């Protein structure tokens, strides 16, 4: 139940432009931000076969995944591959991923407040939005 919302938040981080689909370029920027260096990844989840991943397909893959997954996570965070995650390597991945989620949270706050890009608010609307 509540896990679907968490999966939607994981989906929205990849779907930066918010069109409802994860492109191969949108999947590539996050992988590069994790220190990694692609078409098979998209094709492995695309059930409709249009070349992009929508949320229902992302839900099936993430739900079907729920040991070995944490090992792959350890490998991604262990950048130099020395068998340990140092303070700098943990900080780097969590700062990069944390800042990107903050950006997604900002875009959701702007869309929710009716500005939704290229919009504006005067002082009266700013006070109403920034209080209560």
């Amino acid at each position: 139940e509540e896990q679907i919302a968490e999966f939607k938040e994981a989906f929205s981080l990849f779907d930066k432009d918010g069109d409802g689909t994860i492109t191969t370029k949108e999947l590539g920027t996050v992988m590069r931000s994790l220190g990694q260096n692609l078409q098979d990844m998209i094709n492995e989840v695309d059930a409709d076969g249009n070349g992009t991943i929508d949320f229902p397909e992302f839900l099936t893959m993430m739900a079907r995944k729920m040991e070995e997954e944490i090992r792959e996570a350890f490998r991604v965070f262990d950048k130099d591959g020395n068998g340990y995650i140092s303070a700098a390597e943990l900080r780097h991945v969590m700062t990069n991923l944390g800042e990107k989620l903050t950006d997604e949270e900002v875009d959701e706050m702007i869309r929710e407040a009716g500005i939704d890009g290229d919009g504006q608010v005067n002082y009266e609307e700013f006070v109403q939005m920034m209080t209560a």
Binding site: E6, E44, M61
Partner: peptide, 23 residues
């Protein structure tokens, strides 16, 4: 699976943020 594990890697860090927020 390295593919789903890569997608799961971001989810784990995201869940660590959420669990740390409720504290």
């Amino acid at each position: 699976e390295v593919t789903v594990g890569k997608f799961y890697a971001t989810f784990l860090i995201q869940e660590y943020f959420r669990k740390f927020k409720k504290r």
